[model samples]
Target chain A: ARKFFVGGNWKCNGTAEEVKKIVNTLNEAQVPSQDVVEVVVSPPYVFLPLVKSTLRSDFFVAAQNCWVKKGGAFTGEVSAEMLVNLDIPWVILGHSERRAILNESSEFVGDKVAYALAQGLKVIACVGETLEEREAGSTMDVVAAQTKAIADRVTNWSNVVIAYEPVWAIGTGKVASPAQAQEVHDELRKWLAKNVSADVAATTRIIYGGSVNGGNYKELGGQADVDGFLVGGASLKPEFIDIIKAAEV
Target chain B: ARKFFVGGNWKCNGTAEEVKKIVNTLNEAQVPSQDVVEVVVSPPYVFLPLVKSTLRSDFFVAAQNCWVKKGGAFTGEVSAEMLVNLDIPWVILGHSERRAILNESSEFVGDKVAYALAQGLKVIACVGETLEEREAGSTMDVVAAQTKAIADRVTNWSNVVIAYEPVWAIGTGKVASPAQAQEVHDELRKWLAKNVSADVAATTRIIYGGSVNGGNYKELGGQADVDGFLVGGASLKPEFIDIIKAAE
Candidate 1:
């Protein structure tokens, strides 16, 4: 049985004061035991130290992104080495926002996943198809190709949590987490079973990475293959507490 | 004449202890006072606060890069608003490293320049010609095109310091930015005079961003318009003190 995981990628929002306030709220809100449910909040790189020091001890902190490899003269990039030295335990890679906006190719994202894991940081690696690709029915191929890019470089899968972001549902709001989340989650689990070893497929926690809300946590997470969540905007609100409560389900 | 400026772009190298020690060394160094030359250090985003609070009162801190616009949903980007809120006073945008590696084009870099300035942070906007462009003798054209992309968007050049990095001189070490730095510095100064108003050209500081070290600060900085430096690897060394001592 895989443990339930709730990852809140704060992306590029929040002031220092705002971060403190949010962390305080999260720490105050009691969640299920970490033994059963693993809760993680992903803060922007600048605020990681602040968040890590202030966040709930049981709840983990993750960096939204890191550089492809070692720390050096790569201007304007944070390296995995820096995150490791800082004791930041997890990092989110391959978010579609980066893929679409920054032109981060699947192979580059894969390199990041490998380097990040090598540095001892667990990864919340994202895989998804854009609305255009989904509209044309190429979702699984795109998903599998991107997944293959990461999996080929990764020798071990224990430290990796696959975040399935149904890009079509993003920006459309909390409408699709129930049906769309499971459809891909089930398909992804089966893909893992067929392509990789059945043990790897059974053990990996493939979480939903879009439009999660307090009202739909149980509905979205109840799907047998929907291991947990990689929440977005709602992650900053009090609804996040209710979403984390999905562990109780 | 513009006051000399020295900006140490620390890039992405250091641990917590390493950061503290670097700050201590910089703080203890007896470089010329701020009135003589403006000293700034650009650290990675993670160490900005640490360096800011611990750096010399005479010195300043800058973020190596920031988001093009207001921060929201742009994963892995640091926003100018966050820097402003953190009291970070300066930023280095459009370094050739980013332009070449990460695909930050001139317009995007210009957008970052305008946005960062609007957020009240000073800008160290870098413009350079690659080795290929230089070998083909299109150096100034490439330089002007990139600068044009930035200058068109910017209405005020007061807070902007242009770092002229000669791409060939980058990894090759301390070779061209002198003859190369001044040649472009003169041309860039002239470009400013011919295109923008003379006052804008005259007052703007065009600094060098390449292999600068203690042994050669005077030779490089002596050029009429080579107002200062945006130091790289040497920024972390004790020799950085000799380089900073150039202003004296």
Candidate 2:
């Protein structure tokens, strides 16, 4: 069985006080099975240092995004090397918001994954289909292409975790059914087994994201292939601890 | 005379040690006429708090960029309200890199300017044309449209500082000649005078940015309408203090 992994993607939210409070809450929470489950909290770039300094050793901190280059002349962007220099260990790249709002193509997201991994930083490489693409029945095709972009460039899988966040469900209070999520996860795993290595296919953690909440996470976490979660809005609430402990069984 | 304003846009550069050393260099430099020259340093967003705590009281801190919204769901972005909450007093909007590289439209830049000013933060609103546009005799047209986007939305000019940085010259080592810079600055002033108020035109500081360094800043500062400079590459070096004192 894979190690249950959970990541809180605090997408573009929180002030210094709020961040401190959340970190304090997690620090004090009674996560009885934390030794078995891996937890990472991704805060906005501005709060990465604060989270890193304040959060407990059990939890890891991640940057919400990073630029493709190591550094220099790219104004309004933070590089992976800068994040590493600041002791930030992980980065969440190619989220749907960045894809729809910021115009990041799959190829661009792949380049970031390659560069970030090259700099010795772990990556939460996100991929999924949109509502339109889903309606057109190209969900698997869309996700496969997106996955291929990264699988082609990266040889190492130990530091990379795949996050499958359906764009339509994100922040819309809509979540995929456990069966629907597992189907995709299983297919993704099968694809990895064929395209890369069966060892990587079995070892790599494919987490789900998109309106994952405390109430539904227990059932979703019970799926066979659903190894973990990349949480969204629910990550801010105290219930994040509950979701963190969802995989205890 | 307009207060001789100087801003160092440390665009996407510097580490914690580098930032500390640069701030220390400025803190030790003697600027007897500092009262006459207003100085602001814009560092990357990650280092804004660090710069604020370590930078001298005489120098103000500005965020290199900010989002139009107050906050929410826009990952990988810092909001103007967040900057204000952090006590950062200034923001640079419509930078050439953000415009050309990031696909930020002039109207979008205008919206950020409006939002930033409304949030009680001062703005260094940049406006300039590309080499192709300049050569096509549409330099004034391109700049006018860019400026008008802000002028149309913003009713107050008290917190607005116009930075005219030609795309051709920024980081390309192509310094705009004094005459060339003054011509655009004069035209910009004329536009402000006619469209806004004569008071705003007379009082507003039109700063130049584009390959400004210790060597060229003194001559550029001598121009009639060049009230200040937005130093780029030299902002990281100790010579930034020299550029800060150039208007003297």
Candidate 3:
């Protein structure tokens, strides 16, 4: 059975003091279930440890991004090794924000996924298509190319959780319809089953993102292929609980 | 009557622990004369505050690079505002490494200088020509364009310290002769006098940076236009004291 996973990408958003409040809320809030689901949250680099200490033990922490090198001249970049050293066990790689704004190429993202996996850190490897590509009927084409970049590099899929966050819908308040998200997700599962082993494909949780909130989450969470979500905006609010409860259904 | 300044650019070197040792050494070392010369250091961003607390009160600190905006969505970036809030008073802008490795344009460097100055931070604004430009006899032309870019943006030069670190000389043990350095320094001084104002040129300190160490400090320090240094490899050691003394 595929284990449901939820991850948050707090992309360059909070100050140290502000994130403390968010983490406190997560700690104080009662989780709906722990038997079949896993929760992970990523904060800005400076606030990782603060969040880690505040979140419940069962809930893991992830870094928003990491450097390939252990340590060196890459200023302002935290390393995957540092995350490991700090006992943080998960990382979100290849977010559209990183790819679009920071010029992180597909090959580089694949390399990062391979490195993070090598370090024994679970990855919420994000892949998605832009509005133009989706309108052109190239959703699977874009997702396929991104996945191939990683799949070709890393044979083992044990540590990776594919989060399908369509670029057009993310932070734009345009949640992908349940049918639209499931279509791409089903295609991903199909491709993975063929490219990787069936066991790996079956076990990997394919979560959906892009404007995921408590209000819209139930319909999307009901999709057979949409295992969970990588929530934004709402993840920062108390409403994140409602979205987590929706996952239980 | 020059107010001497010394900066050590600890580029891409040392761990957090070793950084403490280096800073401890500087903290404990007795300077020949602290009143005569001012001291500042720039460590990698991760170690900036760590190194800052370890230094003596007379010493100041700087960040090697910082984003123009205070902060935002730029991952793997430290901002000028963070530096200011952290009480890091100086910022090194337009280093050759940033120019060559990161593809930083002069216009962008100018923007950084302007923003940093507006944040009430002092700037060690680096400007120099490469070996190729020097060979082509366009050293002054390259330097002129860089200085002009900042001069166009900044009205006051009070907190600006121009660092003339020749790309060919940096870390290469190829020190420019005092005359060669002074020639460009004089050109910059004259340009400031002609374009900006006479008082600004006379008061502004144009320092040399590139293979600057204790051995050659006396000769280079004696130059009329060469006010101080932006020491590289030597700045990591106790010898940086002598480099400061040379500026006297």
Candidate 4:
């Protein structure tokens, strides 16, 4: 029995005042169903606590990124150890933007994920292929390469969720069809089974992202491979409730 | 008349809980009467508002670094306009660490200064030379080039304070001798006089940085070329008060 997990990636958006209001809104809203799902909000680091303090206990907070080192002279980089100290229980590591814009390598992301888990932080380990790779029919190869880079380092699967987000579909409004997404997700689970242990693979939840919303979750949720979602734009809106509800069955 | 300026650069230090203790310390401490001296605390961006809310109204707040853009997709980078909107009066631009580690170019710093100033925010515009350049006696030339780079774009000096921090001296515990610091400051004044008119030179406050403390401020303050001090390592201590007194 896998628990449904949903995350909102507010990537570098909103001011301090704006975040206060958004969290206030989140605090007042109803979660619809409680026991069946777990919800988390990964805000910009500046707003992490602001959201953390405002939200109910059922909700969790996550840092969008964290440094590999606990603390040192690395200017402007927060560490996983610091997040652990802050009681921030989760972190979304190796999102494609971090790799693309900040020039973070797969090896660095691998080190960060392993280190975060060691610090007792749950990780939404994001992996995906670019439009070019998908067009070239190398999506599975890219996904396998990224996952293998991290899985090679850490043997623990207890606190990690593999989030499969295709680069072409993210924020682009061109979602991969349910069949397309499930095919890749099923392949990934099979790869995890072969690369990692079967018991870990059987229990591990492989989530789908990239333009996930209320309209598409039912179709995507019906797939055996798609356990849940790491939602984006819709997560901030009321429609996210529908996405969660659609997954209840 | 130039304002006497003091700033504490709490570089990569303190947690949220510790910051409250320091803020309480500052909130209760007695700030001496010094004419037109603006005291600022430039903590890490995470603790800016936390410190700002606890400090006295007479004191100002600054971020150690900010992105040139107002707000966008630049992760882990604070924005200049966001600071402006928050009414944070000052920003410390182009620290040596930013130049070396983050690969920030002089042109980028200049653009940031221009953007920050245009938004009606004041700037603690830092310029310095490396150890090799100091040995080669290119301190003045390097300082002049960096200053002129920003001065060329923003002609006004009224809103900016020139912090002449020597790279070799910063955090090295190697405080530049008063004479050594005065020499470059004098040259900087002369360059300002030549490049941006005499009024700007006289009015612009050229403060010394790098290993500054209460003990060094007296001699550095004695120089006609040195306007004041940018106390660094000592800025975190109780003796920062003594440095301010020496500057007075």
User: On residues A1-249, what C-alpha lDDT tens digit does candidate 3 reach at each position?
Assistant: 677777766655665456778888888887667876788887665456567767789888888777654555443346676677668899988987778866778888999898888878888898999999989999989999999999988858988999898989876767677888889999999999998888987888899977754477878878888888887766677887666777676
Query: TM for chain B in all models?
Result: 0.97, 0.97, 0.95, 0.94
Every model's DockQ: 0.85, 0.69, 0.27, 0.32
What's the lDDT for all of these models?
Answer: 0.88, 0.87, 0.79, 0.77
Candidate 2 CAPRI level: medium
lDDT of 4 at B61: 88
Which candidate model has the greater DockQ, 1 or 3? 1
Indicate the worst ten consecutive residues by lDDT in candidate 4 chain A: A69-78
Docking class of 4: acceptable
Residue-wise C-alpha lDDT for candidate 2, range A74-137, written one tens digit per residue: 7678888778878889999998888888898899999999999999999999999988998999
Flag the better candidate by lDDT, 2 or 3. Answer: 2
Off by over 4 Å in 1: none
TM per prediction:
0.98, 0.97, 0.82, 0.85
> Which residue ranges in model 4 land beyond 4 Å of their true spot?
A32-34, A148-157, A172-174, A203-206, A212-214, A233-236, B34-36, B84-87, B131-157, B172-175, B189-197, B229-233
- Candidate 1 TM-score, C-alpha based: 0.98
lDDT per residue as tens, model 1, A104-210: 99999999999999989999999998778988989888998999999888888889999998888777753564766777788888888888889989999999887
Candidate with the greatest DockQ versus the true structure: 1
B91-134 in candidate 1: lDDT tens per residue? 99998889989989889998999999999999999999887899
Worst 10 residues of 2 chain B by lDDT: B209-218
Question: Candidate 4 local accuracy as lDDT?
Answer: 0.77
Ranking by TM-score: 1, 2, 4, 3
Better of 2 and 3 by TM-score: 2
For model 4, report DockQ.
0.32
